[PDB]
């Protein structure tokens, strides 16, 4: 299906995320891009979705991530909202109900999202060559 709306939506969110850092984008998550042994693209998308899921689930209510002003409060709110969108679309793209993560390597959420963006950028370039 190449560049379907699911891919277009992921790219739009990736572009909207990078347009707002939160004090918490420095917290660390598992780096499933280290891709040590060989896994398929769907397993990667699935694992990425799963790593994003572990993050909003634990840090959505984290007061330390809210800052001190209304602008920073909504920034955390928007961030959490877009990560859920990212997760469900990547999970639907993978078409998998199971993808166990064993990777030890940690990564900052910002670098993780940066690396996902490179991968989505190459995927995207695949349907308008």
């Amino acid at each position: 299906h190449k560049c379907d709306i699911t891919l277009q939506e992921i790219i739009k969110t990736l572009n909207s995320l990078t347009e707002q850092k939160t004090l918490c984008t420095e917290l660390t998550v598992t780096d499933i891009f280290a891709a040590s042994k060989n896994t398929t693209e769907k397993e990667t998308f699935c694992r990425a979705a799963t790593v994003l899921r572990q993050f909003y689930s634990h840090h959505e209510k984290d007061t330390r991530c809210l800052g001190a002003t209304a602008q920073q409060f909504h920034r955390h709110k928007q961030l959490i909202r877009f990560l859920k969108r990212l997760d469900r679309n990547l999970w639907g793209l993978a078409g998998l109900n199971s993808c166990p993560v064993k990777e030890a390597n940690q990564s900052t959420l910002e670098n993780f999202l940066e690396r996902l963006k490179t991968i989505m950028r190459e995927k995207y370039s695949k349907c308008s060559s």
């Binding site: 379907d4 709306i5 699911t6 277009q8 939506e9 739009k12 909207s16 899921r53 689930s57 928007q78 909202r81 859920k84 969108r85 469900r88 679309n89 999970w91 639907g92 793209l93």
Partner: protein, 188 residues
């Protein structure tokens, strides 16, 4: 009872999905039926929609979604007390009917202006095409339709009758149907 017409739903891709169906023989939807709907995702919660009638044999239900993306799918279960009458699924992104533009007002030139009904962060926001309909109030048949793009929700017309104007919108990329028309306004 029996469901004559299986539930068919449409989604505004923001916060509401409306489904409708038909059962055989008179039915009081709000007391007899319950449409349960749940996102098919590990993290989800079963929700209950209480229907209302659209005729003596017809029912309508408004499902509320907090946010919706392309991959999202919903399991829909129509229960009557403790009897499951029908079980199916609904993918919002494939049945998008957009919310209608509103706040349509009229201000040489003639300027019409209205509101995009979606917030900036909605995936639909930048995919909207507007169709503005103008017609001489004093006997229609003589009308014009102006297509306007997503970017700026306004229309400057130059071209003694009094005219009425309405505006609707659709989103090509999401292969949507047309929204309902906005309330219409008028000028001389």
């Amino acid at each position: 009872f029996k469901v004559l017409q299986e539930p068919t739903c449409v989604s505004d891709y923001m916060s509401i999905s409306t489904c409708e169906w038909k059962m055989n023989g008179p039915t009081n939807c709000s007391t007899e039926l319950r449409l349960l709907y749940q996102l098919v995702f590990l993290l989800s919660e079963a929700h209950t929609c209480i229907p209302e009638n659209n005729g003596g044999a017809g029912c309508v239900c408004h499902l509320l979604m907090d946010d919706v993306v392309s991959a999202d799918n919903y399991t829909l279960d129509l229960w009557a007390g403790q009897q499951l009458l029908w079980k199916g699924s609904f993918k919002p992104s494939e049945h998008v009917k957009p919310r209608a533009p509103g706040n349509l007002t009229v201000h040489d030139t003639l300027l019409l202006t209205w509101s995009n009904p979606y917030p900036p962060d909605n995936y639909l926001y930048n995919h909207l095409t507007y169709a503005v309909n103008i017609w001489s109030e004093n006997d229609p048949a003589d009308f014009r339709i102006y297509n306007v793009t997503y970017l700026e929700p306004s229309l400057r017309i130059a071209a003694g009758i009094s005219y009425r104007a309405r505006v609707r919108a659709w989103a090509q990329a999401y292969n949507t149907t047309w929204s309902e028309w906005s309330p219409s306004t008028k000028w001389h």
